[PDB]
Design a protein around this ligand. Sequence first.
Ligand SMILES: CCOC(=O)[C@]1(CS)N[C@H](C(=O)O)C(C)(C)S1
Ligand SMILES: [Zn+2]
Ligand SMILES: [Zn+2]
Length: 241
Amino acid sequence: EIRPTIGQQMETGDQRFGDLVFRQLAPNVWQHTSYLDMPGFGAVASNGLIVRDGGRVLVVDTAWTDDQTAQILNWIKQEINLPVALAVVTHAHQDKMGGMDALHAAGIATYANALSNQLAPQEGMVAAQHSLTFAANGWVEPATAPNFGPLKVFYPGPGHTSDNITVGIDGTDIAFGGCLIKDSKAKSLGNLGDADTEHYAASARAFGAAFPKASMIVMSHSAPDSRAAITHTARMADKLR
Ligand SMILES: CCOC(=O)[C@]1(CS)N[C@H](C(=O)O)C(C)(C)S1
Ligand SMILES: [Zn+2]
Ligand SMILES: [Zn+2]
């Protein structure tokens, strides 16, 4: 069993598939979890989402590597058996974009914040094929999110990184905060090296206000939590200013 140093442990209802873990959150929504070993530190988990929308599947975030991301696609083939229409990635760090080549090799259309695509080369990432842009209130410009179906993309402002984006799943109680939101038991906001400490708290609060009725908050490095994760994150970030 994989017992990560960062991220949730394995729980009943989880399915191991290769070195990845999959957990159903709702009839048409699953969380994907992949792991990276950090020397002297142990395993670090990263979570993303898989959404069944009619006759197609939509993915939020890659795994850490191409090989792990290919296994996401294999799991989808086995357990859902519908084509993957698109993937959205939520910022230009390895846990979210490290597997872009596996998606492109498979012919899957990929989307990221334009700024994420602009930063990807510097971050050692392969840029997505398409760029999302955002209104002043943070909501995606819909022409840049073609056929996103239930994925409702929101840019909350700079926080974890300047490019971080978030995704609500329409028709469910689920919203995905990515690496911006930490669970309510977190002791810190983690590594702040790329973070905007001035704007982080407001960005976290903006995420909460954008998806006011989501009751299950999914995040990159913790198990799903209640809305308290948002407020606790924002109050930790208040201390950075
Ligand atoms: C290059 C590996 O690092 C990463 O890709 C992340 C991106 S969020 N960095 C975080 C950090 O260093 O705190 C993390 C929680 C370990 S995962
Ligand atoms: Zn990150
Ligand atoms: Zn992360």
